[PDB]
């Protein structure tokens, strides 16, 4: 019943936004007793916390699937980035949830990026130690790479459904290699 | 001047209480102007978000140009401008809530802000590419990569903490930029 509440919430919030979606809509669409909502969630905004945790987990597994079978950390970045943009395109209906989280639950919005950065920092520190990538604060470098991904996702996937041309995809690979390769 | 009092009052109130809780009565009282005047300048409350975002865009871009006008090397414009952005973002930090709620309440002006910035950015970058200063790639895509970095770094190092970047991190960021952009 918890899971049904969660799945119903995701579809409704993505559709109508947060403020328009009542607990009633959610429990109605989920097909559970209205009372159970309040047991699992003191306030309506507490639902966002578990939603963003699931998205964070799914996005990371998705990307990990494509990055764990790869050689160069520089390949990891190039492929990882490409795959994030594909992922964002598959999940573009849901981006409204993330926008709403930044308004109504800023702590979980921060959590999402900080959790992603924590995972990313480890991987980049290992490549630094091999001499594979530029030796710099690896948290800082994670935010640089995440910031790039987020903004391209907005411009080329959310605000346009063009995606990137082949020429832009080659330019972006060149940007990333040039940034990361020790001179 | 009435218009300027209304705008200043709105900025302060929206930053403090959010957009939904700020009434036109609050705005015009804080402003010290006749209530009905608001409706002469703005059809709706939402229309004053558009004007606020325009003013912040102009003023951010004026501030940065001020530091970057004096530098011939585009590589230096990018290092310095990034630093100056973090300083501006620190100074205007309490206002960032306005931008967050603009994404929900006026998404066309939120997008406009980034598109306008990239428009100005794109011109400066293709100039540098011509002279062989920087890597020859799609200059709008490059804009969005650099804007993306700037935005995520402001979030992590200015809005989510008030620590800022260390001196070492600042040099690391300089290197990241120089590495990305130099063929
Ligand atoms: C609101 C919408 C809009 C949301 C829109 C959000 C906008 C995001 C903007 C930023 C975009 C990016 O930067 S995306 C990054 C693009 N670049 C890259 O991907 C290149 C770098 N890649 C990497 O370093 C890595 O691929 C990662 C770090 C990103 C993720 O690796 P990771 O996090 O270490 O992966 P890992 O722990 O191994 O496993 C991931 C999660 O999967 C689960 N998991 C583990 N095993 C299994 C299993 N058998 N079945 C199911 N699930 C499993 C775990 O519970 C774990 O979460 P848990 O329970 O352990 O916590
Ligand atoms: C909501 C809260 C938070 C909002 C939070 C916002 C989040 C931002 C996240 C990303 C931030 C970034 O990437 S900041 C990017 C950081 N990087 C850099 O700065 C490096 C590269 N820098 C540059 O290339 C340039 O410095 C710029 C592009 C960023 C800006 O140059 P520009 O856009 O050409 O500036 P320019 O048009 O010449 O002047 C800007 C405005 O000044 C006005 N202006 C005013 N007074 C004067 C005057 N006396 N003389 C001339 N012009 C004047 C003009 O009308 C013009 O507006 P008008 O004619 O257009 O009306």
Numbering used by the authors:
A (entry chain A): 14 to 196
B (entry chain B): 13 to 195
What does the publication say?
FadRSa, of which we show that it displays structural similarities with bacterial TetR-like FadR regulators, is an archaeal member of the widespread prokaryotic TetR family. Each subunit displays two functional domains: an N-terminal helix-turn-helix (HTH) DNA-binding domain (α1–α3) and a C-terminal domain (α4–α9) of which α8 and α9 stabilize dimerization. The finding that FadRSa represses the Saci_1103-Saci_1126 gene cluster and that it is responsive to acyl-CoA molecules acting as inducers in vitro strongly suggests that intracellularly present acyl-CoA molecules cause a derepression and thus higher transcriptional expression of the gene cluster in vivo.
Next, we prepared FadRSa crystals in the presence of lauroyl–CoA (C12:0-CoA) and solved the FadRSa–lauroyl–CoA cocrystal structure to a resolution of 1.90 Å. In contrast to the initial structure showing an acyl-CoA derivative bound to only one of the subunits, in this structure, both subunits of the dimer harbor a lauroyl–CoA molecule. The orientation of the ligand-binding pockets within the protein and the binding mode of the ligand is completely different in FadRSa as compared to the characterized bacterial FadR proteins. In contrast to the ligand entering the pocket from within the dimer interface as in bacterial FadR regulators, in the FadRSa structure the ligand enters the protein from the outer surface of the protein completely opposite to the dimer interface. Further, for each ligand-binding pocket only a single FadRSa subunit is involved in ligand interaction in contrast to two subunits in the bacterial FadR regulators. The lauroyl chain is deeply buried into a tunnel-like binding pocket formed in between helices α4–α7 and is entirely surrounded by hydrophobic residues such as Phe68, Phe97, Phe111, and Phe126. Alanine substitution of the CoA-interacting residues Arg73 and Arg86 confirmed their importance for the ligand response. Subtle differences were noted in the relative orientation of the HTH motifs within a dimer with the binding of lauroyl–CoA causing the distance between the two α3 helices to be enlarged from an average 37.0–43.2 Å (measured as the Cα–Cα distance of Tyr51 residues located in α3). As a consequence, the increased distance between the α3 helices makes the dimeric FadRSa conformation suboptimal for interaction in consecutive major groove segments. Besides the α3 helix, the α2 helix is shifted by an average distance of 7.9 Å and the α4 helix is displaced with an angle of 9°.
